[PDB]
Amino acid sequence: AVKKFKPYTPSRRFMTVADFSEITKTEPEKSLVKPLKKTGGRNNQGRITVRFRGGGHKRLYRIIDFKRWDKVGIPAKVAAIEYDPNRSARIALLHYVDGEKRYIIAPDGLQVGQQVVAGPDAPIQVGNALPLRFIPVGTVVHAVELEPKKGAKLARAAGTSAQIQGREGDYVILRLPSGELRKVHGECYATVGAVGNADHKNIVLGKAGRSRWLGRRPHVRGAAMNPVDHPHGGGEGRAPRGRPPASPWGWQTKGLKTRKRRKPSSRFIIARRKK
Amino acid sequence: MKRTWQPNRRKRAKTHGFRARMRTPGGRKVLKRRRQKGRWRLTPAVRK
RNA sequence: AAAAAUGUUC
RNA sequence: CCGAGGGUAGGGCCCGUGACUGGGGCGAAGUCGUAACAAGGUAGCUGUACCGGAAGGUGCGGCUGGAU
RNA sequence: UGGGAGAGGGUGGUGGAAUUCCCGGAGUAGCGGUGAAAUGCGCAGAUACCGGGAGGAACGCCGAUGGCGAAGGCAGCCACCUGGUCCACCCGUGACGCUGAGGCGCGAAAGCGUGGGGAGCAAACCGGAUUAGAUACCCGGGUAGUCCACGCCCUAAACG
RNA sequence: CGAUGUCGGCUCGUCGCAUCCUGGGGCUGAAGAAGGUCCCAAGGGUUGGGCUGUUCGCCCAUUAAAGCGGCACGCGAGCUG
RNA sequence: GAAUGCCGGCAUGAGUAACGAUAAAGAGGGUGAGAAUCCCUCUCGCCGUAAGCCCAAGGGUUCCUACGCAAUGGUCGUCAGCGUAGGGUUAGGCGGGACCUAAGGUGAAGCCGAAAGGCGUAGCCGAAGGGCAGCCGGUUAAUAUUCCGGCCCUUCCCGCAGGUGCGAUGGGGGGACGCUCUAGGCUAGGGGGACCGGAGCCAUGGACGAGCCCGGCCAGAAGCGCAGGGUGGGAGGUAGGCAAAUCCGCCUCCCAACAAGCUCUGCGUGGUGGGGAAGCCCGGGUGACAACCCCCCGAAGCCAGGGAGCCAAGAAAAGCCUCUAAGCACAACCUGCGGGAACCCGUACCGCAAACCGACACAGGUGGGCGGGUGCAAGAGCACUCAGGCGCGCGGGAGAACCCUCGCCAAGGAACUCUGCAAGUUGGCCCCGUAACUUCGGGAGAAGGGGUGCUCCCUGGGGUGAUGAGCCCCGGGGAGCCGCAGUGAACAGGCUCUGGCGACUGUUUACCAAAAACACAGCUCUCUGCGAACUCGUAAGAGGAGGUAUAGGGAGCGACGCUUGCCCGGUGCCGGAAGGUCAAGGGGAGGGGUGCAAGCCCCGAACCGAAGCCCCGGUGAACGGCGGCCGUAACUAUAACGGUCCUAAGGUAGCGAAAUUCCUUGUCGGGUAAGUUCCGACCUGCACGAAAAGCGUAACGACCGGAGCGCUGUCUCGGCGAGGGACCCGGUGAAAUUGAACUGGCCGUGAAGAUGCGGCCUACCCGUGGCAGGACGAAAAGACCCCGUGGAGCUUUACUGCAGCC
RNA sequence: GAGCUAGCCCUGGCCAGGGUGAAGCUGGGGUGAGACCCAGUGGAGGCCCGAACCGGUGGGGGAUGCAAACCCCUCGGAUGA
Ligand SMILES: [Mg+2]
Ligand SMILES: [Mg+2]
Ligand SMILES: [Mg+2]
Ligand SMILES: [Mg+2]
Ligand SMILES: [Mg+2]
Ligand SMILES: [Mg+2]
Ligand SMILES: [Mg+2]
Ligand SMILES: [Mg+2]
Ligand SMILES: [Mg+2]
Ligand SMILES: [Mg+2]
Ligand SMILES: [Mg+2]
Ligand SMILES: [Mg+2]
Ligand SMILES: [Mg+2]
Ligand SMILES: [Mg+2]
Ligand SMILES: [Mg+2]
Ligand SMILES: [Mg+2]
Ligand SMILES: [Mg+2]
Ligand SMILES: [Mg+2]
Ligand SMILES: [Mg+2]
Ligand SMILES: [Mg+2]
Ligand SMILES: [Mg+2]
Ligand SMILES: [Mg+2]
Ligand SMILES: [Mg+2]
Ligand SMILES: [Mg+2]
Ligand SMILES: [Mg+2]
Ligand SMILES: [Mg+2]
Ligand SMILES: [Mg+2]
Ligand SMILES: [Mg+2]
Ligand SMILES: [Mg+2]
Ligand SMILES: [Mg+2]
Ligand SMILES: [Mg+2]
Ligand SMILES: [Mg+2]
Ligand SMILES: [Mg+2]
Ligand SMILES: [Mg+2]
Ligand SMILES: [Mg+2]
Ligand SMILES: [Mg+2]
Ligand SMILES: [Mg+2]
Ligand SMILES: [Mg+2]
Ligand SMILES: [Mg+2]
Ligand SMILES: [Mg+2]
Ligand SMILES: [Mg+2]
Ligand SMILES: [Mg+2]
Ligand SMILES: [Mg+2]
Ligand SMILES: [Mg+2]
Ligand SMILES: [Mg+2]
Ligand SMILES: [Mg+2]
Ligand SMILES: [Mg+2]
Ligand SMILES: [Mg+2]
Ligand SMILES: [Mg+2]
Ligand SMILES: [Mg+2]
Ligand SMILES: [Mg+2]
Ligand SMILES: [Mg+2]
Ligand SMILES: [Mg+2]
Ligand SMILES: [Mg+2]
Ligand SMILES: [Mg+2]
Ligand SMILES: [Mg+2]
Ligand SMILES: [Mg+2]
Ligand SMILES: [Mg+2]
Ligand SMILES: [Mg+2]
Ligand SMILES: [Mg+2]
Ligand SMILES: [Mg+2]
Ligand SMILES: [Mg+2]
Ligand SMILES: [Mg+2]
Ligand SMILES: [Mg+2]
Ligand SMILES: [Mg+2]
Ligand SMILES: [Mg+2]
Ligand SMILES: [Mg+2]
Ligand SMILES: [Mg+2]
Ligand SMILES: [Mg+2]
Ligand SMILES: [Mg+2]
Ligand SMILES: [Mg+2]
Ligand SMILES: [Mg+2]
Ligand SMILES: [Mg+2]
Ligand SMILES: [Mg+2]
Ligand SMILES: [Mg+2]
Ligand SMILES: [Mg+2]
Ligand SMILES: [Mg+2]
Ligand SMILES: [Mg+2]
Ligand SMILES: [Mg+2]
Ligand SMILES: [Mg+2]
Ligand SMILES: [Mg+2]
Ligand SMILES: [Mg+2]
Ligand SMILES: [Mg+2]
Ligand SMILES: [Mg+2]
Ligand SMILES: [Mg+2]
Ligand SMILES: [Mg+2]
Ligand SMILES: [Mg+2]
Ligand SMILES: [Mg+2]
Ligand SMILES: [Mg+2]
Ligand SMILES: [Mg+2]
Ligand SMILES: [Mg+2]
Ligand SMILES: [Mg+2]
Ligand SMILES: [Mg+2]
Ligand SMILES: [Mg+2]
Ligand SMILES: [Mg+2]
Ligand SMILES: [Mg+2]
Ligand SMILES: [Mg+2]
Ligand SMILES: [Mg+2]
Ligand SMILES: [Mg+2]
Ligand SMILES: [Mg+2]
Ligand SMILES: [Mg+2]
Ligand SMILES: [Mg+2]
Ligand SMILES: [Mg+2]
Ligand SMILES: [Mg+2]
Ligand SMILES: [Mg+2]
Ligand SMILES: [Mg+2]
Ligand SMILES: [Mg+2]
Ligand SMILES: [Mg+2]
Ligand SMILES: [Mg+2]
Ligand SMILES: [Mg+2]
Ligand SMILES: [Mg+2]
Ligand SMILES: [Mg+2]
Ligand SMILES: [Mg+2]
Ligand SMILES: [Mg+2]
Ligand SMILES: [Mg+2]
Ligand SMILES: [Mg+2]
Ligand SMILES: [Mg+2]
Ligand SMILES: [Mg+2]
Ligand SMILES: [Mg+2]
Ligand SMILES: [Mg+2]
Ligand SMILES: [Mg+2]
Ligand SMILES: [Mg+2]
Ligand SMILES: [Mg+2]
Ligand SMILES: [Mg+2]
Ligand SMILES: [Mg+2]
Ligand SMILES: [Mg+2]
Ligand SMILES: [Mg+2]
Ligand SMILES: [Mg+2]
Ligand SMILES: [Mg+2]
Ligand SMILES: [Mg+2]
Ligand SMILES: [Mg+2]
Ligand SMILES: [Mg+2]
Ligand SMILES: [Mg+2]
Ligand SMILES: [Mg+2]
Ligand SMILES: [Mg+2]
Ligand SMILES: [Mg+2]
Ligand SMILES: [Mg+2]
Ligand SMILES: [Mg+2]
Ligand SMILES: [Mg+2]
Ligand SMILES: [Mg+2]
Ligand SMILES: [Mg+2]
Ligand SMILES: [Mg+2]
Ligand SMILES: [Mg+2]
Ligand SMILES: [Mg+2]
Ligand SMILES: [Mg+2]
Ligand SMILES: [Mg+2]
Ligand SMILES: [Mg+2]
Ligand SMILES: [Mg+2]
Ligand SMILES: [Mg+2]
Ligand SMILES: [Mg+2]
Ligand SMILES: [Mg+2]
Ligand SMILES: [Mg+2]
Ligand SMILES: [Mg+2]
Ligand SMILES: [Mg+2]
Ligand SMILES: [Mg+2]
Ligand SMILES: [Mg+2]
Ligand SMILES: [Mg+2]
Ligand SMILES: [Mg+2]
Ligand SMILES: [Mg+2]
Ligand SMILES: [Mg+2]
Ligand SMILES: [Mg+2]
Ligand SMILES: [Mg+2]
Ligand SMILES: [Mg+2]
Ligand SMILES: [Mg+2]
Ligand SMILES: [Mg+2]
Ligand SMILES: [Mg+2]
Ligand SMILES: [Mg+2]
Ligand SMILES: [Mg+2]
Ligand SMILES: [Mg+2]
Ligand SMILES: [Mg+2]
Ligand SMILES: [Mg+2]
Ligand SMILES: [Mg+2]
Ligand SMILES: [Mg+2]
Ligand SMILES: [Mg+2]
Ligand SMILES: [Mg+2]
Ligand SMILES: [Mg+2]
Ligand SMILES: [Mg+2]
Ligand SMILES: [Mg+2]
Ligand SMILES: [Mg+2]
Ligand SMILES: [Mg+2]
Ligand SMILES: [Mg+2]
Ligand SMILES: [Mg+2]
Ligand SMILES: [Mg+2]
Ligand SMILES: [Mg+2]
Ligand SMILES: [Mg+2]
Ligand SMILES: [Mg+2]
Ligand SMILES: [Mg+2]
Ligand SMILES: [Mg+2]
Ligand SMILES: [Mg+2]
Ligand SMILES: [Mg+2]
Ligand SMILES: [Mg+2]
Ligand SMILES: [Mg+2]
Ligand SMILES: [Mg+2]
Ligand SMILES: [Mg+2]
Ligand SMILES: [Mg+2]
Ligand SMILES: [Mg+2]
Ligand SMILES: [Mg+2]
Ligand SMILES: [Mg+2]
Ligand SMILES: [Mg+2]
Ligand SMILES: [Mg+2]
Ligand SMILES: [Mg+2]
Ligand SMILES: [Mg+2]
Ligand SMILES: [Mg+2]
Ligand SMILES: [Mg+2]
Ligand SMILES: [Mg+2]
Ligand SMILES: [Mg+2]
Ligand SMILES: [Mg+2]
Ligand SMILES: [Mg+2]
Ligand SMILES: [Mg+2]
Ligand SMILES: [Mg+2]
Ligand SMILES: [Mg+2]
Ligand SMILES: [Mg+2]
Ligand SMILES: [Mg+2]
Ligand SMILES: [Mg+2]
Ligand SMILES: [Mg+2]
Ligand SMILES: [Mg+2]
Ligand SMILES: [Mg+2]
Ligand SMILES: [Mg+2]
Ligand SMILES: [Mg+2]
Ligand SMILES: [Mg+2]
Ligand SMILES: [Mg+2]
Ligand SMILES: [Mg+2]
Ligand SMILES: [Mg+2]
Ligand SMILES: [Mg+2]
Ligand SMILES: [Mg+2]
Ligand SMILES: [Mg+2]
Ligand SMILES: [Mg+2]
Ligand SMILES: [Mg+2]
Ligand SMILES: [Mg+2]
Ligand SMILES: [Mg+2]
Ligand SMILES: [Mg+2]
Ligand SMILES: [Mg+2]
Ligand SMILES: [Mg+2]
Ligand SMILES: [Mg+2]
Ligand SMILES: [Mg+2]
Ligand SMILES: [Mg+2]
Ligand SMILES: [Mg+2]
Ligand SMILES: [Mg+2]
Ligand SMILES: [Mg+2]
Ligand SMILES: [Mg+2]
Ligand SMILES: [Mg+2]
Ligand SMILES: [Mg+2]
Ligand SMILES: [Mg+2]
Ligand SMILES: [Mg+2]
Ligand SMILES: [Mg+2]
Ligand SMILES: [Mg+2]
Ligand SMILES: [Mg+2]
Ligand SMILES: [Mg+2]
Ligand SMILES: [Mg+2]
Ligand SMILES: [Mg+2]
Ligand SMILES: [Mg+2]
Ligand SMILES: [Mg+2]
Ligand SMILES: [Mg+2]
Ligand SMILES: [Mg+2]
Ligand SMILES: [Mg+2]
Ligand SMILES: [Mg+2]
Ligand SMILES: [Mg+2]
Ligand SMILES: [Mg+2]
Ligand SMILES: [Mg+2]
Ligand SMILES: [Mg+2]
């Protein structure tokens, strides 16, 4: 339920903020926060290798559990639901009856104080983590591993979710958020339910400064540079692309596919993405 | 206005100092060449 | 289950 | 002190007029097509939407004020 | 008070038929289409037939000249929440009634916003015909939209 | 071409005369007035404004008249730009 | 003898410009060979959120003294940041190290690279971050939280006593965190006092006064008081914190719950130690047995790790506490007391600057803290002023032009000009008042207007305190006084209407462009299934991202509103197990060389054989493209209409002489006296047009236009005045430039613009202040143009390679 | 060679004073319940004015400079990209 502002500045008429209604706790768990080494988009050589990065708000990285098979059968309580600056989703704080405390990303519907568990025998219930094979066909899942015991890699962004469309051997057929149809291993864990905070995509950043708070530095069009800089550089006055629209490095950027043709996971993609 | 020389002893020693020179093949040659010339100062003098 | 328009004036 | 009024400034209503522009009305026998009236030759009409020299056409739904 | 009838309304769920796309088999020179054709599709293996799958939308028979709602309108099936309504007994209240400028709410379709969704259908648009022309009818495509959520719009041959 | 700074304006003038005005004439299809035209004449004078960078030009209001040219299309070791 | 030659020396310009902020000087006395310039005193002026003070960096003896004045000092010099000599920097507590980590760097393990080297987990290093013990005063010519005095504290070592399962680099807690706003109580700092202390003063008309002037504190251990921060207690279970755990984490139960208790800071008090002015006398002494008190104002600082709200969600690690592990429980640890022990480095001086960065004693640049008083609504603003520091290291005169900076101006009032450039105007606060339009915020400080000082009188509420006095803070009403003028000085919007462009705040060519350019939220296309795409790297390894399609890359467009048409023939891209072409390779008909030969060797056809291209389709918010000619209407005119040729399709909505219109100052209309501009229209649009977006759009703009009001020295049209220069004198004394010069006008001539030739004319010798027409004046071996088989940046369907990719 | 300059990383510091007055909260009104209306409180913002500070708009001076980019007047941002 994105929060609109009255137009009391130029930028406030479009600026919407998250409603933060599901958050129950406004300070991370100490035993779970490490410093997030900000990069500015620069590699170990020092070079900018992803452009227009930096200067965003300081952050603390919250350790998330993408391996909920680590604590099979040990139930846990949903202690809180918390903010996380490092992802689009909300993170849930779990008190395992072990006395172990872990963070997980918060699926939609998950209510503070409910019990969740992980394992083959888990109820098909919001926030439980079963191997893909033990989840019934037609179930909406998120935080899906892509290879057994390697960590939840799919459907972790706000509102995302994969769907189990059918089975075939040691593999189940998943419809990823992208609309791709993939074979993911049945022993791969997923968490039933979609990720919470669907409204995340309806947030209107509002002004340039907001983007800078996200660590996003200004983006310079190729069309505005000189021929030393960019295939779209130069021209007298404004100028159209004048060639197949291209990246700063020469390659075409309109339709040109770039997935490795001989990639071994091709055997596991049923149907390239939709739309 | 602000000019180019903004002296800083720590900077001077970490950039042009004897130890910085010896750490890289170029710096070693630098010292080598200044010794062969007979410089009185292989590295800049800075007080620490 | 219709091929095919139009028509000077009191 | 108030005070005719005069002055400076800013408003509201009304009227006349204005390059040009929009349709409207009318104008015995102009130009294009033939939409409607017979099932008017694709039944019509309708609110709406898009489109087309133009009447109109088409979609969606509605009405019979439709033939057999 | 005790009963009844009903596509009344909202939410969630769920069932089968059909169209489409995909996958497998099998299979050959046409298919499709019309007034007749052409466009289109098809030996790069279409159509037709079988199995599997994905998806969305609409509910055949019952079905009616029937039912319900104030109207717009409402049709598979299940449950939940809920409105109106008729009937019997003649129990209670004791005119508390009727209408209603404003106000408020509802309000088919189409349209609009933000999302989702998208099979079939289909304004716009394309192409094939027809034709003097054919910015139409008829044909092969096809985008909005049609569907869902929320919010607008507030129109009508909103008619008995 | 081991540099002669380019239009326009401003400022300062100075010269020419194919004279715009002013002085003097002849001819007139010169009645007068006022014109026309040619001749002599460079002494002095030759306005303020709107438009446009403009020169020029058009226009407004005047004027005796609102001359045309040369001076490195006079004049940036004077200014503007 | 020439090379804008090289080096040096010395000329010229020239006693010329200049002598570095216009804050400012004058006199007396001293010193001395010599004095505007040094010392002293008096007077005067300037800074005072500094031009004062204290830190940090940088500098490196510049510090203090004694003796000096050749050079340095833009003059002088007896002075000095200068020459010589001597002296000066004193710490367990300040700063840094013997503590901790941040980025980063480095790096046992490990990985990679022709070599050199590149990486890399831990670890180590790495500070202005964390952590940690000293405050006040005195002293030196020069150092002082450093020496001294007072009063305190830290750790290390040993011992004594008491208490305890002690013990760690291991577990855990804590350390530990943002931004804005902010409570209470304090302190720093300040104001006043009719109270306390003080040497005095009574002037020039008055005042012996509740007069004036001056000062009225500082540090402090325990205890105590005030204010705050931190913190539940117990029990039972336990599978988690990579061993263990009595700790922490999880569940239960009893009690406690604004508390209290325990603890830690702040502040006050506090034994005690200090300080202590004006004035006078020569840094000192007196004052002085100085007093040291009350009220108010009051932090941004302190209690603090306080509170609230927000979204962008806000280091680490040690110290410290706790838990247990080896071990050890004669130990060890904890607490208390005692004695001993406590190292290396810095410490001078400048430090918004004459000592640092700018070649200079350079009007520039340089982080942190303090920064007093009064008045002005507030403040670090502005004026003045304290403390303190300065008058800027050439002076003296004169009183021209001209220039700078400044003041004023009759009448006019933009007539100036490319343009109101510039300069006026406006100007704070309080009150009244405020339009189109609008996205309902705005526009808005719209516009416009009134008010503003001082005196007296009455009264309202606030803080403090006590509920009162006093002080202090917001006001309200009535009556008056004066001036040209009351925000009387200083600081402080001119305004309106209307287009263009860009939504907006932002960004930019450091040093000629701040814009309409870039950016921007937002929109679309596109790539990307995660060992992602993409980027950097030979690689390793990184970035992407400790992210996962609501995400990440690329590209265009650029808030928002309304929209974004038709062309897929070409080019791109995407799809297409057929067909065609196609390399290596396979294949090996068939030839060939050779040899007595077995054989060895070469050639080699069909045929199989990738991507790519061909080919078939799709695709425009991919590259892009969106016609011609002729005719036709009951007037002319013009064509809704037709004919035909071509196209892949022929430019739709909207807009249009435009940031686009050649002709052009188009035509018409508005505004003006007059309008190549401007605004509104028209539309035969040379050559708009729909995300290189089309058309609009409130708000915003040091953008660019047009108009009006206000006001002006912009101007008609200049005048006067000020100061700093220019001028004279004393001091010091450059520069570019310079073939040599004894360097005139005209008309000619001359390589075509002559001081230099001819002819004529003019002209005594030499300067000074001035002006710039000439010396084709200076400066820069023309930056335009061409030339060179010179160079470089950039492009591509130029050529040819290479990376990368298939 | 990043002691200038450009970006980023880490860790610190700075931003006088005044103006406007968003959400929310409270109370009242409102209704079947609502939306909502109002008042008070609240203190939001690449909000407003304006020092420090960061700038560098227009003009003037400067031009062998005080300065190889300075000075004066003016002007932009000043809780934020
Ligand atoms: Mg909003
Ligand atoms: Mg609103
Ligand atoms: Mg939330
Ligand atoms: Mg931690
Ligand atoms: Mg990272
Ligand atoms: Mg590195
Ligand atoms: Mg390196
Ligand atoms: Mg990159
Ligand atoms: Mg970057
Ligand atoms: Mg989050
Ligand atoms: Mg994310
Ligand atoms: Mg798998
Ligand atoms: Mg978005
Ligand atoms: Mg961020
Ligand atoms: Mg951009
Ligand atoms: Mg460019
Ligand atoms: Mg460019
Ligand atoms: Mg480059
Ligand atoms: Mg290149
Ligand atoms: Mg290029
Ligand atoms: Mg280009
Ligand atoms: Mg260019
Ligand atoms: Mg360009
Ligand atoms: Mg162009
Ligand atoms: Mg360009
Ligand atoms: Mg290209
Ligand atoms: Mg895919
Ligand atoms: Mg600089
Ligand atoms: Mg230098
Ligand atoms: Mg610096
Ligand atoms: Mg340093
Ligand atoms: Mg350094
Ligand atoms: Mg540095
Ligand atoms: Mg070094
Ligand atoms: Mg280095
Ligand atoms: Mg080497
Ligand atoms: Mg070596
Ligand atoms: Mg040397
Ligand atoms: Mg030596
Ligand atoms: Mg060296
Ligand atoms: Mg028919
Ligand atoms: Mg006809
Ligand atoms: Mg007839
Ligand atoms: Mg009156
Ligand atoms: Mg009168
Ligand atoms: Mg008809
Ligand atoms: Mg019909
Ligand atoms: Mg049609
Ligand atoms: Mg075929
Ligand atoms: Mg075949
Ligand atoms: Mg589908
Ligand atoms: Mg009925
Ligand atoms: Mg009864
Ligand atoms: Mg409706
Ligand atoms: Mg509808
Ligand atoms: Mg009916
Ligand atoms: Mg030349
Ligand atoms: Mg020369
Ligand atoms: Mg020259
Ligand atoms: Mg010259
Ligand atoms: Mg010359
Ligand atoms: Mg020229
Ligand atoms: Mg003039
Ligand atoms: Mg005459
Ligand atoms: Mg006559
Ligand atoms: Mg004359
Ligand atoms: Mg002309
Ligand atoms: Mg002209
Ligand atoms: Mg006359
Ligand atoms: Mg002339
Ligand atoms: Mg001539
Ligand atoms: Mg000239
Ligand atoms: Mg000429
Ligand atoms: Mg000419
Ligand atoms: Mg000339
Ligand atoms: Mg000239
Ligand atoms: Mg000039
Ligand atoms: Mg000129
Ligand atoms: Mg000259
Ligand atoms: Mg001259
Ligand atoms: Mg010679
Ligand atoms: Mg020379
Ligand atoms: Mg030479
Ligand atoms: Mg030489
Ligand atoms: Mg010599
Ligand atoms: Mg010499
Ligand atoms: Mg001389
Ligand atoms: Mg001389
Ligand atoms: Mg002289
Ligand atoms: Mg001279
Ligand atoms: Mg000079
Ligand atoms: Mg000088
Ligand atoms: Mg000077
Ligand atoms: Mg000054
Ligand atoms: Mg002054
Ligand atoms: Mg004197
Ligand atoms: Mg002297
Ligand atoms: Mg002397
Ligand atoms: Mg003195
Ligand atoms: Mg005196
Ligand atoms: Mg002061
Ligand atoms: Mg030095
Ligand atoms: Mg000397
Ligand atoms: Mg001497
Ligand atoms: Mg000597
Ligand atoms: Mg000297
Ligand atoms: Mg001297
Ligand atoms: Mg000097
Ligand atoms: Mg001397
Ligand atoms: Mg002497
Ligand atoms: Mg000393
Ligand atoms: Mg000590
Ligand atoms: Mg030691
Ligand atoms: Mg360390
Ligand atoms: Mg090495
Ligand atoms: Mg280091
Ligand atoms: Mg430290
Ligand atoms: Mg310390
Ligand atoms: Mg102390
Ligand atoms: Mg103990
Ligand atoms: Mg213990
Ligand atoms: Mg913490
Ligand atoms: Mg933290
Ligand atoms: Mg910290
Ligand atoms: Mg104190
Ligand atoms: Mg005070
Ligand atoms: Mg005390
Ligand atoms: Mg407890
Ligand atoms: Mg346990
Ligand atoms: Mg403390
Ligand atoms: Mg502060
Ligand atoms: Mg604090
Ligand atoms: Mg707090
Ligand atoms: Mg915030
Ligand atoms: Mg760390
Ligand atoms: Mg023992
Ligand atoms: Mg030691
Ligand atoms: Mg010291
Ligand atoms: Mg300064
Ligand atoms: Mg400072
Ligand atoms: Mg100094
Ligand atoms: Mg100083
Ligand atoms: Mg020096
Ligand atoms: Mg310099
Ligand atoms: Mg000086
Ligand atoms: Mg200086
Ligand atoms: Mg004071
Ligand atoms: Mg004030
Ligand atoms: Mg002076
Ligand atoms: Mg000064
Ligand atoms: Mg001076
Ligand atoms: Mg004189
Ligand atoms: Mg004289
Ligand atoms: Mg001055
Ligand atoms: Mg006067
Ligand atoms: Mg005047
Ligand atoms: Mg006037
Ligand atoms: Mg006027
Ligand atoms: Mg004017
Ligand atoms: Mg201009
Ligand atoms: Mg103008
Ligand atoms: Mg209004
Ligand atoms: Mg208006
Ligand atoms: Mg407007
Ligand atoms: Mg409004
Ligand atoms: Mg106001
Ligand atoms: Mg006003
Ligand atoms: Mg007075
Ligand atoms: Mg003012
Ligand atoms: Mg102002
Ligand atoms: Mg215009
Ligand atoms: Mg711009
Ligand atoms: Mg802008
Ligand atoms: Mg816009
Ligand atoms: Mg923008
Ligand atoms: Mg920048
Ligand atoms: Mg520039
Ligand atoms: Mg430049
Ligand atoms: Mg430059
Ligand atoms: Mg430069
Ligand atoms: Mg400039
Ligand atoms: Mg600007
Ligand atoms: Mg730019
Ligand atoms: Mg958009
Ligand atoms: Mg690369
Ligand atoms: Mg990686
Ligand atoms: Mg990472
Ligand atoms: Mg842009
Ligand atoms: Mg095409
Ligand atoms: Mg194509
Ligand atoms: Mg095609
Ligand atoms: Mg192939
Ligand atoms: Mg294009
Ligand atoms: Mg093209
Ligand atoms: Mg083309
Ligand atoms: Mg259209
Ligand atoms: Mg036009
Ligand atoms: Mg025009
Ligand atoms: Mg236009
Ligand atoms: Mg054009
Ligand atoms: Mg034109
Ligand atoms: Mg023209
Ligand atoms: Mg005209
Ligand atoms: Mg116009
Ligand atoms: Mg025309
Ligand atoms: Mg384009
Ligand atoms: Mg264009
Ligand atoms: Mg609008
Ligand atoms: Mg606008
Ligand atoms: Mg702007
Ligand atoms: Mg701006
Ligand atoms: Mg601007
Ligand atoms: Mg003047
Ligand atoms: Mg004077
Ligand atoms: Mg004399
Ligand atoms: Mg002299
Ligand atoms: Mg001298
Ligand atoms: Mg001679
Ligand atoms: Mg002469
Ligand atoms: Mg001569
Ligand atoms: Mg000649
Ligand atoms: Mg001559
Ligand atoms: Mg001769
Ligand atoms: Mg001669
Ligand atoms: Mg002569
Ligand atoms: Mg002289
Ligand atoms: Mg002179
Ligand atoms: Mg001259
Ligand atoms: Mg010459
Ligand atoms: Mg000349
Ligand atoms: Mg000359
Ligand atoms: Mg000249
Ligand atoms: Mg030059
Ligand atoms: Mg040369
Ligand atoms: Mg040359
Ligand atoms: Mg040159
Ligand atoms: Mg040229
Ligand atoms: Mg040439
Ligand atoms: Mg050649
Ligand atoms: Mg060449
Ligand atoms: Mg080259
Ligand atoms: Mg290569
Ligand atoms: Mg590629
Ligand atoms: Mg730097
Ligand atoms: Mg530096
Ligand atoms: Mg630096
Ligand atoms: Mg600030
Ligand atoms: Mg106010
Ligand atoms: Mg308020
Ligand atoms: Mg609140
Ligand atoms: Mg602001
Ligand atoms: Mg304001
Ligand atoms: Mg300037
Ligand atoms: Mg100059
Ligand atoms: Mg210069
Ligand atoms: Mg300045
Ligand atoms: Mg100023
Ligand atoms: Mg700003
Ligand atoms: Mg401001
Ligand atoms: Mg401020």
Numbering used by the authors:
A (entry chain 1D): 2 to 276
B (entry chain 17): 1 to 48
How do the authors describe this structure?
Tetracyclines inhibit protein synthesis by binding at the A site of the small ribosomal subunit and blocking the accommodation of an incoming aminoacyl-transfer RNA (aa-tRNA) into the A site of the bacterial 70S ribosome. More specifically, tetracyclines bind at the decoding center (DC) between the head and the shoulder of the 30S subunit, in a pocket formed by helices 31 (h31) and 34 (h34) of the 16S ribosomal RNA (rRNA). In this work, we determined two (2.8-Å and 3.0-Å) X-ray crystal structures of sarecycline bound to the initiation complex of the bacterial 70S ribosome and found that this antibiotic inhibits bacterial ribosome in part using a mechanism of direct mRNA contact, which has not been reported for any other tetracyclines so far. SAR is chemically distinguishable from other tetracycline antibiotics by the 7-[[methoxy(methyl)amino]methyl] group attached at the C7 position of the ring D.
To understand the functional relevance of the C7 moiety of SAR in the context of the translating ribosomal complex, we have determined the crystal structure of SAR bound to T. thermophilus 70S ribosome containing mRNA, and P-site–bound deacylated initiator tRNAiMet at 2.80-Å resolution. In this experiment, we used mRNA containing phenylalanine UUC codon positioned in the A site of the ribosome. At 2.80-Å resolution, SAR can be unambiguously fitted into the obtained electron density map, including its C7 group. Our structure reveals binding of SAR in the canonical tetracycline site that is located in the A site on the small ribosomal subunit. The polar edge of SAR directly contacts h31 and h34 of the 16S rRNA by forming hydrogen bonds (H-bonds) with the sugar-phosphate backbones of nucleotides C1195 and G1197. Similar to other tetracyclines, the polar edge of SAR also engages nucleotides G1053, G1197, and G1198 via a coordinated Mg2+ ion. Unlike TET, but similar to TIG, SAR also coordinates a second Mg2+ ion to enable an indirect interaction with the phosphate of the nucleotide m2G966 of h31. Interestingly, despite the expected absence of a tRNA in the A site in our structure, we do observe continuous electron density corresponding to the A-site codon of the mRNA, indicating that mRNA nucleotides must be stabilized by macromolecular interactions. Close examination of the SAR binding site revealed that the third nucleotide (cytidine) of the A-site UUC codon (position +6) is in close proximity to the C7 extension of SAR. However, it is also evident from our structure that the methoxy group of the C7 extension of SAR forms a van der Waals contact with the cytidine in position +6, which is a weaker type of interaction compared to an H bond but still can provide additional stabilization of the mRNA, explaining why we observe strong electron density corresponding to the nucleotides of the A-site codon.
